[PDB]
Structure 1
């Protein structure tokens, strides 16, 4: 009964894409009743590989895959898009330093932001996965005049899920009984996983674990988890990143469970005193493609200090992209 929606995915031949696209086409992101048209973008040098990924998608005989098109043109990939998952960012290349990376990312997200504003649905839901996600999302929305800034988000859901997994393991409880986890701030080493409002089968997390464990073990382990995957596998955490992306879009589009919330990095409107405009991870609830920051939560000194550190890092990143003229102003 449902008309197809168009889902654009960039970096489509890369490792995250390879773990992402099949689950999307299977109906895992937007529902088993929702046909999808996949509009896939790569850089020119990866188009040959992308055509291979297209063949594999065909070879799954997915009943919900109502359309499938690969392109190297963002204005084609984003045409009439209902969702856009911006996975492809500047590749790490030998010789490239931070400022070089910033400029390449600046070009990518300026171009993609502009393309989205020109050709996508006005209510396109955008998720930036490619690193540095929060600041790339800022560049994208600032260069998408005519689109609601709050339709641009960045992914902290992988950190959020990692935090839930660590808490479940420590408390010996099923991860499905962990609620109200929050990761605040930047998708970076300064992220703040918040246990002060989290619940384990209805019980406050900090009645089951102590502050020493929280500070000395939990926080660093969540921060280092991406590195841990690389050390073990010799490859980055593509499958769990793809899972997190699916969950981020799914919970935004289909809604968060009653009594629970999720983490999403979204343009700040001053909630919790976070500077307006920076893309900052907040606890949020969602219903029908719209989300709201969960306000009213008590913030103690431990939390405030960490929320402020990560806010400042985001402000520093913003100043650097402002200095490169990638955005005019934060406000």
Structure 2
């Protein structure tokens, strides 16, 4: 019954794409009743590897895969897209300093912002994964004249899921019984996973674990998790990041559970006093393609301190990119 939706994925021959594409075509992100057409974008150097990825997608014989196309032009990839996952971003290079990374990214994200505005569905839903995700989502929406800025989001779902995994281990309860986790700010060393509103089986998180543990054990371990993986595997956490990507999209399109919320970085409308315009991770509920920030939570001083630091870091990078005339 359902007509196919078009899903654009950039960075498609990369590591995250290699763990993401198969699970999307199997129907894990938008439902087992919803056929998908994948429109994959790579840079010209990666096209041959992308062709090999395309062959492996064909070799899975996915009944929901209604169409598959690979290109190196952003106007063909985003053509009529319903969803766009912007995973590609500039690589890191030797002695290539921060502003230099900002500049290169500014380039990709301006171009892609423009392309979306010209050829995608007007209500295209956009997820930016490529780092730095928050600032890249800022640059894209500001270059996508004609699209609603609230359709541009950035991922904090990996940090959210890591925080829920640690709390589950600590309190010895199934991960399916942790609710109301929040990660505020962005995917960085300074993100703030908030346990003041979380619940473990119905009980408040902070009745089961103490502040000492929270502040000197839990916080640093979530912030170090990505480094731990790299030290153990010798490669970054692609499967777990692809999984967070899928969840971020699924929960947005299909809706969040009753009584719960998820973390999403979205353009601020001054909620909790966070400056307008910046892309900032908030507690959010969704229902049918739309989300709203969860307002009214009580912020203590511990919280506010941490939320503010993260707002300031994002305000600064925004400063830099403005200074580069990127926005």
TM (norm. structure 2) is 1.00
Displacement after TM superposition at 1:168 (Å): 0.2
Alignment of 1:17 onto 2:17: yes
Q: Which runs of 4+ in 1 moved over 2 A?
A: none
1:60-96 CA-partner distances (Å, limit 9, x unpaired): 0000000000000000000000000000000112232
Unaligned runs of 5+ in 1: none
1:221-280 per-position Cα deviation (integer Å, ceiling 9, x unaligned): 111111111000000000000000000000000000000000000000000000000000
* CA drift at 1:312: 0.4
SS of equivalent to 1:113: helix
Displacement, 1:121?
0.2
Q: 1:200-229, CA deviations, whole angstroms, 9 ceiling, x for partnerless residues?
A: 001000000000011001111111111111
CA shift, 1:285, in A, is 0.2
For residue 307 of structure 1, give the secondary structure of its aligned residue in structure 2. helix
**Structure 2 runs not aligned, ≥5 long:** none
Q: Deviations over 1:9-40 (max 9, x none)?
A: 00000000000000000000000000000000
User: Whole-Å Cα distance in 2 between the matches of residues 50 and 81 of structure 1?
Assistant: 19
**Matched ranges for 1:1-331 at <5 A:** 1-327=1-327
Secondary structure of the residue aligned to 2:243 is: helix
Give the aligned length.
Answer: 327
- Looking at structure 1, the residues matched to 214 and 318 of structure 2 have their Cα atoms a distance apart, in angstroms, of 30
The 2-side partners of 1:262 and 1:57 are apart by 30
Cα deviation, residue 145, structure 1: 0.6
Aligned with 1:23: secondary structure? helix
Report deviation, 1:315.
Answer: 0.3
Please give the secondary structure, in 1, of the residue aligned with 2:167. helix
Q: Could you give the per-residue CA deviations for residues 39-66 of structure 1, whole angstroms, max 9, x where no partner exists?
A: 0000000000000000000000000000
Which moved further from structure 2: 95-104 or 281-290?
A: 95-104
The Cα offsets for residues 83-131 of structure 1, whole Å up to 9 and x where unpaired, read as: 0000000011223221211111000000000000000000000000000
In the alignment, the residues of structure 2 paired with residue 93 and residue 105 of structure 1 have an alpha-carbon distance, to the nearest angstrom, of 13
The two structures, once aligned, show a CA RMSD in angstroms of 0.5
Instruction: Determine the C-alpha separation between the residues in 1 that align with 2:130 and 2:228.
Output: 19
